[PDB]
Design a protein around this ligand. Structure first.
Ligand SMILES: [Mg+2]
Ligand SMILES: [Mg+2]
Ligand SMILES: [Mg+2]
Ligand SMILES: [Mg+2]
Ligand SMILES: [Mg+2]
Ligand SMILES: [Mg+2]
Ligand SMILES: [Mg+2]
Ligand SMILES: [Mg+2]
Ligand SMILES: [Mg+2]
Ligand SMILES: [Mg+2]
Ligand SMILES: [Mg+2]
Ligand SMILES: [Mg+2]
Ligand SMILES: [Mg+2]
Ligand SMILES: [Mg+2]
Ligand SMILES: [Mg+2]
Ligand SMILES: [Mg+2]
Ligand SMILES: [Mg+2]
Ligand SMILES: [Mg+2]
Ligand SMILES: [Mg+2]
Ligand SMILES: [Mg+2]
Ligand SMILES: [Mg+2]
Ligand SMILES: [Mg+2]
Ligand SMILES: [Mg+2]
Ligand SMILES: [Mg+2]
Ligand SMILES: [Mg+2]
Ligand SMILES: [Mg+2]
Ligand SMILES: [Mg+2]
Ligand SMILES: [Mg+2]
Ligand SMILES: [Mg+2]
Ligand SMILES: [Mg+2]
Ligand SMILES: [Mg+2]
Ligand SMILES: [Mg+2]
Ligand SMILES: [Mg+2]
Ligand SMILES: [Mg+2]
Ligand SMILES: [Mg+2]
Ligand SMILES: [Mg+2]
Ligand SMILES: [Mg+2]
Ligand SMILES: [Mg+2]
Ligand SMILES: [Mg+2]
Ligand SMILES: [Mg+2]
Ligand SMILES: [Mg+2]
Ligand SMILES: [Mg+2]
Ligand SMILES: [Mg+2]
Ligand SMILES: [Mg+2]
Ligand SMILES: [Mg+2]
Ligand SMILES: [Mg+2]
Ligand SMILES: [Mg+2]
Ligand SMILES: [Mg+2]
Ligand SMILES: [Mg+2]
Ligand SMILES: [Mg+2]
Ligand SMILES: [Mg+2]
Ligand SMILES: [Mg+2]
Ligand SMILES: [Mg+2]
Ligand SMILES: [Mg+2]
Ligand SMILES: [Mg+2]
Ligand SMILES: [Mg+2]
Ligand SMILES: [Mg+2]
Ligand SMILES: [Mg+2]
Ligand SMILES: [Mg+2]
Ligand SMILES: [Mg+2]
Ligand SMILES: [Mg+2]
Ligand SMILES: [Mg+2]
Ligand SMILES: [Mg+2]
Ligand SMILES: [Mg+2]
Ligand SMILES: [Mg+2]
Ligand SMILES: [Mg+2]
Ligand SMILES: [Mg+2]
Ligand SMILES: [Mg+2]
Ligand SMILES: [Mg+2]
Ligand SMILES: [Mg+2]
Ligand SMILES: [Mg+2]
Ligand SMILES: [Mg+2]
Ligand SMILES: [Mg+2]
Ligand SMILES: [Mg+2]
Ligand SMILES: [Mg+2]
Ligand SMILES: [Mg+2]
Ligand SMILES: [Mg+2]
Ligand SMILES: [Mg+2]
Ligand SMILES: [Mg+2]
Ligand SMILES: [Mg+2]
Ligand SMILES: [Mg+2]
Ligand SMILES: [Mg+2]
Ligand SMILES: [Mg+2]
Ligand SMILES: [Mg+2]
Ligand SMILES: [Mg+2]
Ligand SMILES: [Mg+2]
Ligand SMILES: [Mg+2]
Ligand SMILES: [Mg+2]
Ligand SMILES: [Mg+2]
Ligand SMILES: [Mg+2]
Ligand SMILES: [Mg+2]
Ligand SMILES: [Mg+2]
Ligand SMILES: [Mg+2]
Ligand SMILES: [Mg+2]
Ligand SMILES: [Mg+2]
Ligand SMILES: [Mg+2]
Ligand SMILES: [Mg+2]
Ligand SMILES: [Mg+2]
Ligand SMILES: [Mg+2]
Ligand SMILES: [Mg+2]
Ligand SMILES: [Mg+2]
Ligand SMILES: [Mg+2]
Ligand SMILES: [Mg+2]
Ligand SMILES: [Mg+2]
Ligand SMILES: [Mg+2]
Ligand SMILES: [Mg+2]
Ligand SMILES: [Mg+2]
Ligand SMILES: [Mg+2]
Ligand SMILES: [Mg+2]
Ligand SMILES: [Mg+2]
Ligand SMILES: [Mg+2]
Ligand SMILES: [Mg+2]
Ligand SMILES: [Mg+2]
Ligand SMILES: [Mg+2]
Ligand SMILES: [Mg+2]
Ligand SMILES: [Mg+2]
Ligand SMILES: [Mg+2]
Ligand SMILES: [Mg+2]
Ligand SMILES: [Mg+2]
Ligand SMILES: [Mg+2]
Ligand SMILES: [Mg+2]
Ligand SMILES: [Mg+2]
Ligand SMILES: [Mg+2]
Ligand SMILES: [Mg+2]
Ligand SMILES: [Mg+2]
Ligand SMILES: [Mg+2]
Ligand SMILES: [Mg+2]
Ligand SMILES: [Mg+2]
Ligand SMILES: [Mg+2]
Ligand SMILES: [Mg+2]
Ligand SMILES: [Mg+2]
Ligand SMILES: [Mg+2]
Ligand SMILES: [Mg+2]
Ligand SMILES: [Mg+2]
Ligand SMILES: [Mg+2]
Ligand SMILES: [Mg+2]
Ligand SMILES: [Mg+2]
Ligand SMILES: [Mg+2]
Ligand SMILES: [Mg+2]
Ligand SMILES: [Mg+2]
Ligand SMILES: [Mg+2]
Ligand SMILES: [Mg+2]
Ligand SMILES: [Mg+2]
Ligand SMILES: [Mg+2]
Ligand SMILES: [Mg+2]
Ligand SMILES: [Mg+2]
Ligand SMILES: [Mg+2]
Ligand SMILES: [Mg+2]
Ligand SMILES: [Mg+2]
Ligand SMILES: [Mg+2]
Ligand SMILES: [Mg+2]
Ligand SMILES: [Mg+2]
Ligand SMILES: [Mg+2]
Ligand SMILES: [Mg+2]
Ligand SMILES: [Mg+2]
Ligand SMILES: [Mg+2]
Ligand SMILES: [Mg+2]
Ligand SMILES: [Mg+2]
Ligand SMILES: [Mg+2]
Ligand SMILES: [Mg+2]
Ligand SMILES: [Mg+2]
Ligand SMILES: [Mg+2]
Ligand SMILES: [Mg+2]
Ligand SMILES: [Mg+2]
Ligand SMILES: [Mg+2]
Ligand SMILES: [Mg+2]
Ligand SMILES: [Mg+2]
Ligand SMILES: [Mg+2]
Ligand SMILES: [Mg+2]
Ligand SMILES: [Mg+2]
Ligand SMILES: [Mg+2]
Ligand SMILES: [Mg+2]
Ligand SMILES: [Mg+2]
Ligand SMILES: [Mg+2]
Ligand SMILES: [Mg+2]
Ligand SMILES: [Mg+2]
Ligand SMILES: [Mg+2]
Ligand SMILES: [Mg+2]
Ligand SMILES: [Mg+2]
Ligand SMILES: [Mg+2]
Ligand SMILES: [Mg+2]
Ligand SMILES: [Mg+2]
Ligand SMILES: [Mg+2]
Ligand SMILES: [Mg+2]
Ligand SMILES: [Mg+2]
Ligand SMILES: [Mg+2]
Ligand SMILES: [Mg+2]
Ligand SMILES: [Mg+2]
Ligand SMILES: [Mg+2]
Ligand SMILES: [Mg+2]
Ligand SMILES: [Mg+2]
Ligand SMILES: [Mg+2]
Lengths: 76, 187, 59, 134
RNA sequence: UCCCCCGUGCCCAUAGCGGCGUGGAACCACCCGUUCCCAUUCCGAACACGGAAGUGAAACGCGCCAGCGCCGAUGGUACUGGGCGGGCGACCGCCUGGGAGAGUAGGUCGGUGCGGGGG
RNA sequence: UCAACGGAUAAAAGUUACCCCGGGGAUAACAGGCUGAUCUCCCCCGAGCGUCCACAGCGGCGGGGAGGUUUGGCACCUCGAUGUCGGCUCGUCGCAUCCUGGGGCUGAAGAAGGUCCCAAGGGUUGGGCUGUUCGCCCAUUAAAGCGGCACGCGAGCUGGG
RNA sequence: UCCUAAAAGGUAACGGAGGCGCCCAAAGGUCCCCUCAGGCGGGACGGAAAUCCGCCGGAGAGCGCAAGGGUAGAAGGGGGC
RNA sequence: UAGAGCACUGAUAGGGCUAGGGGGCCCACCAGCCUACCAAACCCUGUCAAACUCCGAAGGGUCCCAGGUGGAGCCUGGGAGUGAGGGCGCGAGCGAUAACGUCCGCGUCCGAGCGCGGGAACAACCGAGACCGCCAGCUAAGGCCCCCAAGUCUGGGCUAAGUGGUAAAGGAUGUGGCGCCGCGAAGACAGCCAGGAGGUUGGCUUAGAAGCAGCCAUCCUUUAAAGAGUGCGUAAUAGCUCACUGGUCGAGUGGCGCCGCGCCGAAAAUGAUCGGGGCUUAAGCCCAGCGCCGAAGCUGCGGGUCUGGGGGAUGACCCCA
């Protein structure tokens, strides 16, 4: 009875939460599409991954119709 | 209709029900108060009263108030009221559902059939001054398969409807029977 | 604030691991053991969980 | 009907939404106890009701069977039941209104709505219509 | 300090839809033309350039309206960490802390930051 | 298509009732157990049938349950062995009673019968066919009951299957 | 790919459902431009549905293929290099 | 996610509205009008969904800050065993809302606590984590009539079945308690005496259909009263009867709904039984309250050991946790 299939879990989601120090360029969120958009010092790769471009702390922000953004508020 | 209210605050609604006091609220654009009538009492009243007829509430402040029943939430599982709402009226154009007397037995009812009274009341804008105990309906020119919408109404003075001009009030429908069974179970 | 006295009375046996650890943090070794300590927000937090196993006095 | 396929069982926790109030009709029948009511069970009550007052008023049916009923043909363990043997059912939790009658006298509603209760796997109750609305 | 308009950002529908009224003096639009810069899978529609005359019609700014959209309590219940009791069960009840969705009362035709022209 | 996709060789299919060793009740077949869908019985409702008349007698559609004889599900003791159908001998227990005893109802004139209730005390035949159980049949009877006891009974027997 | 999976991640059964073993020198990079589906009305052949004009129409289209997530403030359609 | 919701995908009962279809009158020029039919779209009413979500908890997850010295935590390294698990509570799939069934998730106990008290007996249910000794003490669950420690304890109810001592739809003037409705001293409920009627024989079908098979249904008259009729009955009547009024009588009475305990439904195989005997204002059930018995739990006293600390220049050894 054909059905025993499935794919292996991809383990994705936010990796670093709001108010968390981050090193140069470590990943912050792995997402299916654009559940989140870039931000201050926060670029995104082919798989829509979101990673830091600088050190400092991560902060989230909901911009309604705009989207949900995530960025690093640096310091040094 | 009249009814004696009582003031409430921090006590447990659950505990009140234990004694026999049904909790509820009273409010309008300016008022809002934690209250509770006696169940057995409210029942006698609300049964007769309903959300069509006004109620005079009587607080221990000597205060009388012309409150309409807004909504009553029930205990699913063996029906029974849990908690009430009282809209304190004043003198401005308020809307509210008001009764409906379908007088006269339509052509269908006569020739065997069923009066399906879609509504039993109508949402209509109105002044606290106006509270037509009902609204008669000449439903008698109704043949089997016919209907009566809002557009046809005996609307008393100052009583404009809030609903649609299309929304139907009632209708006559065919009567299910045993001869019907032969056909149903077959096909 | 007042220090809390807390005596253990019902055996923690069979009770979920978490609470096992609470009685540990509250320094509650064995049963029927007395234990007086400061009433801080975080101290109560533990004494809170283990309520069903301890009676709290006030001193 | 359409939907899709076979469906998991799921439990029948408290009769929360399991219930309602009398919509149409003069009287009705409420479930006191949770259960899966079969298609057959339903029709059983229906046809009963009509048969009682021949050429009668109007019977409403507030419940409706959409859960697929799986079952195995007297075997063991490969795959999920081809199911559908009793076919389909309706999730009736304590409180729910199942049938409305209208256009008849009490002694008719009482009797018919009672006879129907004899086809249902459940303890039930027949309601007038108090007044409690909305 | 204030008011009008212009460009820009912010909160992201209480800002929106529609209805009604309103301003061209400055601003903005439309309008005149297409030689030149440049442009249409065809059309100066659009983008682009030169430029008075006309206009506030369209667009837009402003304001009033709630009919639609949008926001929306209170009380109360569902459910529920943690603790306890009951029925063979399908299940149900109590204590302690938490507590909606829906619906109701009601709110809304926005608010504000910077810069520039205009009295 | 090293696709048996972490890929044993470069290079490979059957059969054993002629069979054998190591292991397993970690796992089937018997039986027991748990369960009771299937099975057997009882019951609720009463459309309808029975001239009239829902229960003399009967009961659609659907509902609740008892029992643990069948078919089955699971895999729990038992694979350093718990012998398996049928017959024979000897039985013994249940009662949902086949007969005899007692009783209500009857669409019971009488005789005879229908059906329900009480009631194990004792009784419950001989032969043909088949390994048979089961069943059909012959001739009788008050009747030729059903079922439990490892589908009782192989340190009792048989050994047709 | 989705559900089961109990709002972190994970999570089983001969549990419920469906795909993959490719394709594209443009279906790729960039610069500029552009915005659907669908509904009503008007239109010679057409005709429910070609193409044309109007209005309404925030994403129900589209994104080579399954499904989901995303998405017109482009990832969608056109062009130049 | 539970919940809830219907705005997307689908599902859905009833009605409104309205394309296409069905069927009749009316047609051939094709058109129209009906429709107690089928039905898209749209609307209101009402609802369902693991793989639907406009919405959405308790909670969980992670970072920061603080408490937290614990047979905690981290790092390197030597040594392993284990890779059949099992039951219970909860949340799902499978299963049949079967299984001492199965498969995951969280927890837990057995495993290894078949050691100790409770549950008659019984790994995992309730109580509790056994270092040894004691003819000491408090308590846990459970229990206090005898076997068997300790109350035939106190107070207020209920149950008459041995219910308790462990079965379901469904049933019934079992009994107790609360509530609403109506009747009655201008005389109720019951019983009991009289009428209980007239067109009527209601109309329609049917062989027949006279309140009284089946179908449709709502008159008035004599009156204080008697249904176009309750049930029997005859082939069809009459009949008797309730309904219905008036008298006798003399005080209460009928019903609806909620709650507590009990009754029927209730049939098995070696001999019975709730562990037993026994128990009925209880030795049962519900509420309240004081006391006591009861473990290897805790306290008291003594000893052992190991760790930690303090005394010991001193080791030895001493005290304390
Ligand atoms: Mg799988
Ligand atoms: Mg996956
Ligand atoms: Mg997996
Ligand atoms: Mg998955
Ligand atoms: Mg009037
Ligand atoms: Mg935790
Ligand atoms: Mg000790
Ligand atoms: Mg079923
Ligand atoms: Mg098998
Ligand atoms: Mg009516
Ligand atoms: Mg009525
Ligand atoms: Mg029934
Ligand atoms: Mg029932
Ligand atoms: Mg009932
Ligand atoms: Mg309501
Ligand atoms: Mg100044
Ligand atoms: Mg200044
Ligand atoms: Mg800003
Ligand atoms: Mg205008
Ligand atoms: Mg002008
Ligand atoms: Mg010109
Ligand atoms: Mg030119
Ligand atoms: Mg020129
Ligand atoms: Mg030039
Ligand atoms: Mg020039
Ligand atoms: Mg250019
Ligand atoms: Mg060109
Ligand atoms: Mg020029
Ligand atoms: Mg001018
Ligand atoms: Mg002007
Ligand atoms: Mg204008
Ligand atoms: Mg404007
Ligand atoms: Mg809203
Ligand atoms: Mg709201
Ligand atoms: Mg609230
Ligand atoms: Mg809780
Ligand atoms: Mg809880
Ligand atoms: Mg508690
Ligand atoms: Mg139990
Ligand atoms: Mg809310
Ligand atoms: Mg609403
Ligand atoms: Mg409003
Ligand atoms: Mg607005
Ligand atoms: Mg506007
Ligand atoms: Mg300025
Ligand atoms: Mg200025
Ligand atoms: Mg200035
Ligand atoms: Mg391999
Ligand atoms: Mg190979
Ligand atoms: Mg792998
Ligand atoms: Mg090979
Ligand atoms: Mg070989
Ligand atoms: Mg072989
Ligand atoms: Mg062999
Ligand atoms: Mg051979
Ligand atoms: Mg041979
Ligand atoms: Mg041979
Ligand atoms: Mg040979
Ligand atoms: Mg050999
Ligand atoms: Mg061997
Ligand atoms: Mg085994
Ligand atoms: Mg077996
Ligand atoms: Mg059974
Ligand atoms: Mg069969
Ligand atoms: Mg059967
Ligand atoms: Mg029975
Ligand atoms: Mg029988
Ligand atoms: Mg019936
Ligand atoms: Mg009957
Ligand atoms: Mg007949
Ligand atoms: Mg009948
Ligand atoms: Mg039938
Ligand atoms: Mg049958
Ligand atoms: Mg049956
Ligand atoms: Mg059944
Ligand atoms: Mg049955
Ligand atoms: Mg059954
Ligand atoms: Mg059965
Ligand atoms: Mg078996
Ligand atoms: Mg197993
Ligand atoms: Mg041996
Ligand atoms: Mg032996
Ligand atoms: Mg008997
Ligand atoms: Mg019999
Ligand atoms: Mg006899
Ligand atoms: Mg005789
Ligand atoms: Mg007899
Ligand atoms: Mg042979
Ligand atoms: Mg014989
Ligand atoms: Mg025998
Ligand atoms: Mg057997
Ligand atoms: Mg057997
Ligand atoms: Mg045998
Ligand atoms: Mg032998
Ligand atoms: Mg033998
Ligand atoms: Mg033998
Ligand atoms: Mg031989
Ligand atoms: Mg032979
Ligand atoms: Mg042989
Ligand atoms: Mg996934
Ligand atoms: Mg999803
Ligand atoms: Mg998850
Ligand atoms: Mg998921
Ligand atoms: Mg959870
Ligand atoms: Mg989780
Ligand atoms: Mg779930
Ligand atoms: Mg998740
Ligand atoms: Mg499944
Ligand atoms: Mg290849
Ligand atoms: Mg190209
Ligand atoms: Mg278009
Ligand atoms: Mg149009
Ligand atoms: Mg045309
Ligand atoms: Mg066309
Ligand atoms: Mg056209
Ligand atoms: Mg979108
Ligand atoms: Mg596609
Ligand atoms: Mg796709
Ligand atoms: Mg997902
Ligand atoms: Mg997609
Ligand atoms: Mg998508
Ligand atoms: Mg989307
Ligand atoms: Mg899409
Ligand atoms: Mg592009
Ligand atoms: Mg591209
Ligand atoms: Mg290009
Ligand atoms: Mg929807
Ligand atoms: Mg709806
Ligand atoms: Mg619908
Ligand atoms: Mg429909
Ligand atoms: Mg519909
Ligand atoms: Mg219809
Ligand atoms: Mg038509
Ligand atoms: Mg039509
Ligand atoms: Mg037609
Ligand atoms: Mg014709
Ligand atoms: Mg016609
Ligand atoms: Mg003709
Ligand atoms: Mg038509
Ligand atoms: Mg509309
Ligand atoms: Mg709508
Ligand atoms: Mg609606
Ligand atoms: Mg609406
Ligand atoms: Mg969901
Ligand atoms: Mg969402
Ligand atoms: Mg909403
Ligand atoms: Mg909301
Ligand atoms: Mg936390
Ligand atoms: Mg810390
Ligand atoms: Mg190591
Ligand atoms: Mg394993
Ligand atoms: Mg396991
Ligand atoms: Mg484990
Ligand atoms: Mg486990
Ligand atoms: Mg189980
Ligand atoms: Mg352990
Ligand atoms: Mg033992
Ligand atoms: Mg036991
Ligand atoms: Mg053990
Ligand atoms: Mg044990
Ligand atoms: Mg003592
Ligand atoms: Mg005590
Ligand atoms: Mg005690
Ligand atoms: Mg007493
Ligand atoms: Mg007493
Ligand atoms: Mg007993
Ligand atoms: Mg019962
Ligand atoms: Mg009853
Ligand atoms: Mg009675
Ligand atoms: Mg009188
Ligand atoms: Mg007469
Ligand atoms: Mg006559
Ligand atoms: Mg005649
Ligand atoms: Mg007569
Ligand atoms: Mg007759
Ligand atoms: Mg008249
Ligand atoms: Mg005679
Ligand atoms: Mg005759
Ligand atoms: Mg007569
Ligand atoms: Mg009374
Ligand atoms: Mg019997
Ligand atoms: Mg008590
Ligand atoms: Mg007590
Ligand atoms: Mg004391
Ligand atoms: Mg000790
Ligand atoms: Mg000592
Ligand atoms: Mg030292
Ligand atoms: Mg030293
Ligand atoms: Mg020293
Ligand atoms: Mg020395
Ligand atoms: Mg010394
Ligand atoms: Mg010393």
């Amino acid at each position: 009875t054909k059905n025993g299939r499935d794919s292996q879990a991809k383990r994705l989601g936010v990796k670093r939460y709001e108010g968390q120090v981050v090193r140069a360029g470590n990943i912050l969120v792995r997402q299916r599409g654009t559940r989140f958009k870039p931000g201050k010092n926060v670029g995104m790769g082919r798989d829509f991954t979101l990673f830091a471009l600088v050190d400092g702390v991560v902060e989230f922000q909901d911009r309604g119709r705009l989207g949900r953004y995530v960025h690093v508020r640096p310091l040094a | 209709y009249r009814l004696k209210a009582y003031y409430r605050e921090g006590e447990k609604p659950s505990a009140l029900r234990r004694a026999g006091k049904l909790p509820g609220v009273m409010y309008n654009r300016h008022l809002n108060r934690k209250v509770y009538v006696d169940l057995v009492e409210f029942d006698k009243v609300f049964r007769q009263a309903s959300i069509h007829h006004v109620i005079v509430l009587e607080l221990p402040d000597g205060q009388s108030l012309p409150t309409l029943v807004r909504q009553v939430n029930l205990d699913k599982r063996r029906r029974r009221p849990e908690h009430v709402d009282f809209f304190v009226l004043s003198d401005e154009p308020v809307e509210m559902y008001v009764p409906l007397r379908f007088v006269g037995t339509p052509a269908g009812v006569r020739a065997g059939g069923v009066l399906q009274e879609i509504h039993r009341d109508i949402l209509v804008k109105v002044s606290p001054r106006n509270i037509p105990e009902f609204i008669e309906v000449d439903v008698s020119g109704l043949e089997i398969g016919d209907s009566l919408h809002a557009s046809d109404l005996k609307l008393p003075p100052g009583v404009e409807l809030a609903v649609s001009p299309e929304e139907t009030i009632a209708a006559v429908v065919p009567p299910e029977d045993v001869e019907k069974l032969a056909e149903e179970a077959a096909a | 604030m007042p220090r809390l006295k807390v005596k253990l009375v019902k055996s923690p046996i069979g009770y979920p691991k978490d609470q096992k650890a609470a009685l540990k943090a509250l320094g509650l070794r064995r049963l029927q053991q007395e234990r007086v300590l400061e009433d801080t927000p975080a101290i109560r937090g533990n004494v809170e969980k283990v309520a069903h196993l301890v009676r709290v006095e006030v001193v | 009907r359409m939907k899709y396929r076979k469906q998991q069982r799921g439990r029948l926790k408290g009769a929360t939404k399991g219930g309602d109030y009398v919509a149409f009709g003069d009287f009705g029948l409420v479930a006191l106890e949770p259960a899966w009511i079969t298609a057959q069970q339903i029709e059983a009550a229906r046809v009963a009701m009509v048969r009682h007052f021949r050429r009668g008023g109007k019977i409403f049916i507030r419940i409706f069977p959409d859960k697929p009923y799986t079952k195995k043909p007297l075997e063991v363990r490969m795959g999920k039941g081809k199911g559908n043997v009793e076919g389909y059912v309706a999730v009736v939790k304590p409180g729910r209104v199942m049938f409305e009658v209208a256009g008849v006298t009490e002694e008719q509603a009482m009797e018919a709505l009672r006879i129907a209760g004899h086809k249902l796997p459940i303890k039930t109750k027949i309601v007038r219509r108090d007044a409690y609305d909305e």
